[PDB]
Design a protein around this ligand. Structure first.
Ligand SMILES: O[C@]1(c2ccc(-c3ccccc3)cc2)CN2CCC1CC2
Ligand SMILES: [Mg+2]
Ligand SMILES: [Mg+2]
Ligand SMILES: [Mg+2]
Length: 284
């Protein structure tokens, strides 16, 4: 194990820990691709957690500065303020692949707003949040996941990320509330006559299930649309991206079976992950 090798192993560790599902799927990529994924993910995770876990804006700005250092001087040695193991690895990927740095900055901008949390008025704002937090990631990943870095490849990758995020939100309703966040739009909550506080207290009624299912359908519709254009990605990434999505779609069904609980985090078992991988490989 070289030094860089250890830097990537640490990134791999962060991904296994925080996103078992993405880990399960993207670890099947060729070595050079999965390492890139590990690093890009770890950066994104670090950005997220600096607000969501530490609520530490100063930390957040260290990371942006690190990435900025990288973008500017890809080939100079940086005393990263941030987490030097991750930034060393990102810097390494940057040397070999084209990194959409503005997409990282869009992420940082969006995660920043979570620190002074205000609710969205409309769905279009929630959708813009999904771009900012997940669509951006799809953009950063795009050069890794396909050989055609065109606007149409990007469009599918964006929608992939945003649908993943919407599903993340639909799993996290309870725990986001306990964190005093609601990501359902005010528009849609009123229209459906849902109050998350109230629903948190006395359980899940018919008006909540309708609203949740309204967003689910959108995520499921969007995933379908991505799955059609799966060809945009490389041969090797196609079945992986299909798996990663199938798993995350299965998260919706798990919420459903647990009757939409706002009081635990549902998950897909490794055992069902394996199942899905089988279901998928017959066709590849
Ligand atoms: O930033 C997230 C993310 C991670 C990965 C993808 C993805 C995007 C496109 C394709 C595959 C995966 C999207 C979002 C979302 N949010 C929680 C998870 C990490 C950290 C902040
Ligand atoms: Mg977040
Ligand atoms: Mg978070
Ligand atoms: Mg979440």
């Amino acid at each position: 194990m070289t030094m860089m090798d250890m830097n990537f192993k640490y990134c791999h560790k962060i991904m296994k820990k925080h996103s078992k599902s993405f880990s399960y799927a993207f670890d099947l990529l060729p070595e050079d691709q999965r390492k890139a994924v590990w690093a890009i993910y770890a950066v994104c995770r670090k950005i997220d957690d600096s607000i969501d876990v530490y609520g530490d804006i100063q930390f957040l700005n260290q990371i942006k500065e690190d990435i900025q250092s990288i973008e500017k001087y890809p080939y100079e040695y940086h005393h990263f303020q941030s987490d030097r193991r991750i930034m060393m690895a990102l810097q390494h990927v940057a040397q070999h692949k084209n990194i959409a740095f503005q997409s990282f900055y869009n992420l940082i901008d969006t995660v920043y707003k979570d620190q002074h949390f205000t609710m969205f008025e409309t769905d279009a704002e929630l959708f813009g949040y999904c771009y900012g937090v997940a669509g951006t990631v799809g953009e950063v990943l795009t050069p890794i996941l396909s050989d055609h870095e065109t606007h149409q490849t990007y469009d599918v990758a964006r929608r992939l990320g945003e649908s993943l995020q919407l599903i993340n939100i639909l799993r996290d309703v309870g725990e986001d509330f306990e964190n005093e966040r609601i990501y359902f739009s005010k528009q849609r909550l009123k229209q459906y006559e849902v109050d998350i506080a109230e629903v948190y207290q006395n359980g899940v009624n018919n008006h909540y299930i309708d609203l949740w299912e309204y967003y689910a359908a959108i995520a499921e519709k969007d995933f379908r649309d991505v799955m059609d254009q799966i060809k945009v990605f490389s041969i090797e990434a196609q079945p992986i991206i299909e798996l990663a999505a199938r798993i995350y779609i299965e998260i919706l069904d798990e919420v459903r079976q647990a009757n939409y609980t706002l009081h635990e985090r549902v998950f897909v078992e490794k055992r069902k992950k394996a199942k899905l991988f089988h279901e998928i490989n017959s066709k590849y």
